[PDB]
Structures are given as structure tokens and as C-alpha cells.
Amino acid sequence: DIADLRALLDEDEAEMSVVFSDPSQPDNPSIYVSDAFLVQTGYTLEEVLGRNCRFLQGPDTNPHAVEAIRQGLKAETRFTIDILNYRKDGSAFVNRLRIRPIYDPEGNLMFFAGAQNPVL
Amino acid sequence: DIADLRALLDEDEAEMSVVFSDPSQPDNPSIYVSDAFLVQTGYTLEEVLGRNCRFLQGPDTNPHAVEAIRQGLKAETRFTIDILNYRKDGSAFVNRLRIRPIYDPEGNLMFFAGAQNPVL
Numbered sequence: 001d002i003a004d005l006r007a008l009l010d011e012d013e014a015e016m017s018v019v020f021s022d023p024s025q026p027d028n029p030s031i032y033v034s035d036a037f038l039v040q041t042g043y044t045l046e047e048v049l050g051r052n053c054r055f056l057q058g059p060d061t062n063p064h065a066v067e068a069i070r071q072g073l074k075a076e077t078r079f080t081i082d083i084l085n086y087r088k089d090g091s092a093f094v095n096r097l098r099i100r101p102i103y104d105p106e107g108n109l110m111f112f113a114g115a116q117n118p119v120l
Numbered sequence: 121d122i123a124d125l126r127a128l129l130d131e132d133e134a135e136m137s138v139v140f141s142d143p144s145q146p147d148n149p150s151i152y153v154s155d156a157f158l159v160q161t162g163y164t165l166e167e168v169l170g171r172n173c174r175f176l177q178g179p180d181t182n183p184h185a186v187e188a189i190r191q192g193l194k195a196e197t198r199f200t201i202d203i204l205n206y207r208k209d210g211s212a213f214v215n216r217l218r219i220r221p222i223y224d225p226e227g228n229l230m231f232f233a234g235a236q237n238p239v240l
């Protein structure tokens with residue numbers, strides 16, 4: 001039996017590119033990625049599940065934006081950042097990335113939710 | 121924001137005593153316990169959340185039934201066992217315990233769900 005991770009999505013996220021990660025696993029890997037994510041990025045589920053989402057970054061991604069995300073995750077707070085991301089075919093797009101922490105009833109950090117929106 | 125763990129309950133479990141545990145944490149602690157569980161066992165949420173459910177066992181609990189549960193968990197399969205359990209006030213009851221594993225989209229074990237039913 002498989003956990004319905006999508007039952008933890010916000011209303012805005014249902015038709016969105018969204019990723020859930022497990023920060024209690026080494027390197028905070030994705031444990032769920034929506035079909036919209038896979039469509040936008042050009043990957044199959046097998047290519048990305050269980051990997052840290054940094055594979056979306058590429059040669060012109062700003063390293064300070066990457067460090068900003070890393071510190072935002074450590075802060076365990078809601079944040080949004082515009083970051084240059086890349087599809088499997090090498091094409092680049094500005095990604096408005098919104099991340100929020102999700103806690104268990106004890107109050108321990110449980111998951112991160114990250115929603116991607118191409119900036120048009 | 122808090123994960124709706126109860127959104128992973130089976131239909132029969134909603135008005136039941138149920139526990140979810142996190143086997144990736146040391147000693148497989150409870151991360152969710154229903155109000156029906158707390159009512160039947162006589163505990164407050166603070167007294168039991170984050171503890172392994174073996175606190176339900178007591179002086180006349182059969183140690184082979186305990187070992188059976190331990191092996192069933194290692195097997196990652198659905199199982200049910202009748203085991204003598206105890207409330208905080210020391211009173212004892214026969215517990216028909218049903219446990220099932222819950223996996224993530226990758227297929228890795230994610231949670232255990234355990235439902236308690238007093239045998240009448």
C-alpha cells in the first residue's frame with residue numbers, strides 16, 4: 001500500500017509542478033514528484049525520484065540563489081525565489097520556486113514541499 | 121503546517137484506535153495516535169507520542185507474541201495478533217492488533233499503521 005503524498009498538497013498545488021522531499025534521508029531526496037513536474041522538466045519518474053532536486057540547476061544558475069535555498073531550508077520557513085533552472089534537453093527557464101516545511105504532530109520536521117512555476 | 125497523517129487511514133480505521141509509526145527513526149516511534157487510542161489506554165498525547173508502542177505491554181504479556189510482532193514488522197507484511205495489553209491504570213485487555221506497512225512512491229518502507237481492537 002502506497003502513501004497518498006498528494007493528500008498533503010495545498011489547493012494551488014494540485015495542477016502544479018510539485019515535489020516532496022524527505023529531509024531525514026541523506027541529501028534530502030525527492031520522494032514524490034508530480035506529473036506536471038516531469039512534463040515541464042523532460043524527465044521520467046525513474047530519472048529523478050530519490051534524487052536531490054539540484055539536478056534542475058545548470059551552468060548559468062546563480063550559486064548565491066542556490067545557497068539562499070540551502071539556508072532557507074535550514075531555517076525551516078516558507079520562502080520563494082526566482083532561480084534559473086534547466087530541462088533535460090538543456091533548455092533554460094526562470095523558475096519561481098516556493099518551498100514550505102511540513103511537520104509531524106510532534107512538531108518535528110517531516111517533509112519539504114516545493115512548487116515550481118515558470119516565470120512568464 | 122502539519123501533515124494530515126489520518127488521510128492515510130483505511131475506511132475501517134477512522135473511528136478506531138490507530139497508531140502510525142516511523143521505522144526510519146530510532147526504535148520505530150509513534151508519530152500519530154488517534155484520540156480513540158488515547159481514550160482506551162488512559163494516556164495523554166504527550167505521554168505516548170514519540171515512544172515505541174511496547175509501553176502497551178505488561179507483566180503477563182506473552183513474550184512470544186511480542187517476538188511475533190517484531191518479526192512481522194521485519195517481514196513488512198500485513199498481520200494480526202491477539203496480545204494482552206495494559207492501560208495506564210494497570211488494567212489488562214486482549215488487543216486484536218492489526219499492522220500493515222505503508223510505502224512511498226519509490227517503494228521504500230515509509231510508515232507502519234497499527235489498529236487496536238479490544239477482543240470482546
Ligand SMILES: Cc1cc2nc3c(=O)[nH]c(=O)nc-3n(C[C@H](O)[C@H](O)[C@H](O)COP(=O)(O)O)c2cc1C
Nearest residue numbers: 019020021052053054056057066069070112113114
Ligand atoms: C522540495 C524541494 C524542492 C526543490 N525544488 C527545486 C527546484 O525546483 N529548482 C532548484 O533549483 N532547486 C530546488 N530545490 C533545491 C535543491 O534541492 C537544493 O536544496 C539546493 O540546490 C541547495 O542545496 P545544495 O547547496 O546542497 O545544492 C528543491 C529543494 C526541495 C527540498
Ligand SMILES: Cc1cc2nc3c(=O)[nH]c(=O)nc-3n(C[C@H](O)[C@H](O)[C@H](O)COP(=O)(O)O)c2cc1C
Nearest residue numbers: 139140141172173174176177186189190232233234
Ligand atoms: C504502528 C505500530 C503499532 C503497534 N501497536 C501495538 C499495540 O497496540 N500493542 C502492542 O503490544 N504492541 C504494539 N506494537 C509493537 C511494539 O511497538 C513493538 O514493535 C513490539 O513490542 C516488538 O518489538 P520489541 O521486541 O522491540 O519490543 C506496535 C508497533 C507498531 C509499529
